[PDB]
Point group: D2
């Protein structure tokens, strides 16, 4: 079958593989729509997560179930499904510890294009269908729905880890797709002031749509200075790190109040370490909590985000700046993420 | 000074009182806008808090500071302020335990119209102004602002106690002012489906405005079955008990899932019994948590909710269906509250 | 195979039954040590969970794996294991919400002598072995280990739900086996003062051993007054409800401070409803949280408590007052539990 | 009065000052026992808090109340008290935010030998006696009580921030006084295995006394590998960084499980960067939470810790390896704290 894959670090191309087969609890799905992530880049051209050979890429898909194993009870061929980007093995200690994301090891809950073939093929394999698939209501358009497997769950998890109090001020550092869902997330947790950091025109516009009350552009002076200025030297209650480089940690620590919380949902691809600024961190005694986590996956997560979309609590369609048709265009869409132009938030490819 | 008081159970009337003077840490404040509450009614006519004599009523005001003590540092004569319904003593062990609402006694954080003269007076006394007042921005209309001291903080506390998860389903029982803020609060915590229970058309309209996706009334017999039917016998994640009788508790337990949470923000002042239905409560082992708490007060709570209004995360003006003008219409607004007309949610009296 | 079974409400006896076989993921186990529980007594003589027919009793066992299904990876014939009283289906939505106790339904995680034959049998069936068994270190004596599956997980979950702060004061109501692990559990959460309510001499000695600094007995059914006096009218921070009738709820609420927490680990099998004392619960506004939940089960829970025993953080053997040897003595053990002698805490049949 | 003071960076000596006088809410206290801290050392010799001139040193004392202001209700001349190292101003926004340690700014809760004269004087000033002192029971010996103001509150906060689960494994890095209270703290939160990293024999013996089940030292090479070996490649649930340089941060991140918690209770100064290793931190997505906080102070904290001492939940007397008599030996104890002999944990000076 056709599949667009990371041949080796630095090389990508269309390969051919055996169409996969489902174990008793598994499902085979064909993609209806897919999206590329900057994470696919951080790993192909930067090896942020080690080397690989011939690994079909991509982990954001809505699809149609084409086959299920004999033990699968809730899905059958023909069902339209949202496939979470994280599809954990649900029978592990990590799951008993309440961290399915790390079922089987650090980040191991994230399988597609981390440790198994991704969704950029004619077909793909989902482990444990009943636990890891969600039904797609026909109301919700494909392009919107494909923002759910990853962008929405990551962004919102940023808000969730931040433990936002009603009325509190939040800075979201980065306003790409993830940062934009970070903003929407923070609003849906009751944030008052939300300050987005970024400069892309399309992103600024979307940031305001999602609930940003202020936008800071690096071109107008340093972010910390700008935030301290906006908050009259008081800083903010919460910071969500969604995008940018490792220097954003230091920025987040300098902006946040003592006793506050920093929530990293930014996948850090380069550098050995991240510096925490000693003084601004109260030398380790400022109660400035640093959190950071891979997005939740599985059926329940998807079903919950789907509800939010269904009851119109969030509209992820504004995230999709580019739509193309057909397999051939997965490459185009992939490269668009590598050399991200000024008008890009998230590309989506719709299959026939 | 002039003041609308409770003379005794069942009796209210205009009386003459000594205008209060501030201690070193206090402020005297004159009302700019007040609103009478369901609680004042129950207090007067149903002996909800026991007998009182010549106690000035009302606990919901925005106002102007007219005098401050020698140690007050942040507020000064002429300042427009939101006055929280709850104005704790901040130097107690309850406060060190993190329960200012119960500083110096159960619910002792609530002073106005309880243990001290309330705000239906030419002036009133705010203890510890620096800790118990918030500056009110000019941008916010008085009628909106005066919903903050009680309705908004109470209703939102309900959503807070409920510990709503993103996408989870919520029932709010009672759709008066507090339940409406309960609905708005639940939406701001990221709730998917929000079921409101109540029947007054003005309230149902508002309930929908604030995020209710479904409305139900007992007018079809028994509420629990109706909820179970809406939810396919699954129940809901969270129940907020905002208005109604003590039977409400039993209904909430029955409606909510195992592991769920029920939160009460209704002062049960009648002698009706609070019953937990044994079976529906899994014999006390269903992890159906039961919470109930007097609304937060003090400066920080008010500042945070003011930000919610300011940045347009909530629009509480919908609660305000009647507006009167001039100190004397207090009595009219209070009477109006006593014989609840069908078009009434919340009346406000704006002072000249 | 031979089993000790509920024949019908009111009637027990030895029965012969087909030896169970394992599914792909299951294990068949033989008891090495077993203990009867009050729950066994009630199920049979008070119909507590409804009518059962030829259902093998008992849910507390240390055992040895005799056979495993083809997919079992971590356990094999000969492995000595601790078997949790709670053995959930791990592939359900409840598990995804973090409530394995209620996987597939309220309290559905409890299977032994409820929905399936319990452990008082020559063999018993354990669903999902890899998720529901824990290797037993040789260093731990059987009589100690057998307190883990229910007594220790339950008592400790009382202390857990109680969210105890360091140095805080705790009342444990009921000083039977479960209450005593509640006392031990509270000490292991950093509690300062621990007040045990009860009178039975062997239980009082044991309560002291596990951390109680004070013992009180009901005078003529009354207890709240004695606690207030102990604490100079301040009351206590936390109350764990471990034994006694529904009326201990009112007692817990009256003893606990505003903003405190009450945790129920006591099964209530009688009466339509539990009554909350309105006045003492601050008419629903005193932030006196009411929690209650079936003990955690599964592998990890057992492994954790095993470590507590192994590292000598708690010594459960003092719960064990009577030790019989031999399978046929299950009947004796059970009747000893039915006829609760004054010197009895828990009996243990050691087969081995 | 006489006082032992920081003259200037790198210089210390005895000076003469005016005896402090109480504001209305304040108390004047004479030391009955004092302890020098490692922070008085950095302050003096590393300028860790900036330039100071004639500032009396020390922030650990138990004393007797000599004088109270007119507003002090709960303490009177003659009263023996434990004085918290952290004595915040209780009327601030930060206190309303729940962070008294940062009342009025980052670490501003810590006043003694920071922004006001410390306890190494014939008298010292305590702001807000009623919120900031606790009565000291005769039962508790002076040398032991003096470990409460800072050592115990700090170690235990390490354990609190770490959110230890029952039976979880904990590594405490550093087994100086604070690390030792960290170990005891972890035991009191229900830790199973506790691994202490250190090498000084007296410290190793105290570590074992306080609950360490294993002891590792750097002089067996690199710490992480050893921990992974002890845990068979699994790592630990929790890490408390109580001592050592900043590279401890990277070791802690590397040894903790995905989803784990790291808590810092060590003051990082001088010149070692706080670095988070990217790979071991899962590129910021391994849910390895990093916390760090100044110890709680105030009356309630001290009262709770006094209770744990009173009820024999912990015996801090083991931290005191050196006791001297005489106000004058304050210098000797200080220098002893500077050049740190192999046999020193904590020294105490006992006054007449
Ligand atoms: Cl009683
Ligand atoms: Zn991604
Ligand atoms: Zn924090
Ligand atoms: Zn719950
Ligand atoms: Zn509470
Ligand atoms: Zn110190
Ligand atoms: Zn974590």
């Amino acid at each position: 079958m056709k599949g667009f894959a990371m041949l080796s670090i630095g090389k990508v191309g269309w390969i051919e593989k055996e169409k996969p087969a489902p174990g008793p609890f598994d499902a085979i799905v064909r993609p209806l729509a897919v999206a590329p992530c900057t994470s696919d880049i951080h790993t192909v051209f930067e090896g942020a997560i080690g080397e690989r050979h011939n690994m079909i890429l991509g982990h954001e898909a809505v699809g149609e179930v084409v086959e299920v194993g004999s033990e699968v009870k809730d899905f059958k061929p023909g069902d339209r499904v949202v496939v979470p980007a994280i599809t954990p093995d649900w029978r592990t200690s990590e799951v008993q510890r309440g961290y399915h994301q790390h079922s089987g090891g650090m980040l191991a809950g994230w399988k597609f294009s981390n440790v198994k073939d991704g969704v950029f093929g004619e077909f793909f394999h989902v482990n444990d269908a009943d636990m890891n698939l969600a039904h797609l209501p026909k109301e919700i358009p494909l392009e919107a729905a494909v923002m759910i497997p990853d962008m929405m769950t990551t962004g919102f998890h940023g808000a969730e880890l931040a433990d936002i109090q009603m009325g509190s001020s939040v800075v979201v550092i980065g306003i790409g797709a993830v940062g934009l869902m970070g903003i929407a997330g923070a609003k849906l947790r009751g944030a008052g002031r939300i300050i987005g950091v970024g400069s892309r025109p399309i992103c600024v516009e979307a940031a305001k749509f999602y609930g940003a009350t202020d936008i800071l552009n690096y071109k107008n002076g340093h972010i910390v200075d700008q935030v301290m200025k906006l908050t009259n030297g008081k800083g903010v209650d919460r910071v969500i790190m969604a995008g940018g480089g490792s220097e954003t940690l230091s920025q987040a620590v300098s902006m946040v109040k003592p006793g506050g919380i920093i929530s990293n949902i930014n996948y850090h691809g380069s550098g050995d370490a991240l510096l925490i600024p000693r003084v601004e961190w109260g030398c380790g005694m400022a109660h400035k909590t640093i959190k950071g986590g891979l997005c939740p996956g599985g059926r329940l997560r998807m079903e919950r985000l789907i509800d939010l979309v269904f009851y119109k609590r969030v509209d992820p369609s504004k995230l999709v700046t580019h739509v193309f048709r057909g397999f051939d265009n997965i490459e185009k869409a992939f490269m668009l993420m590598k050399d991200k132009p000024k008008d890009l938030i998230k590309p989506v490819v719709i299959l026939a």
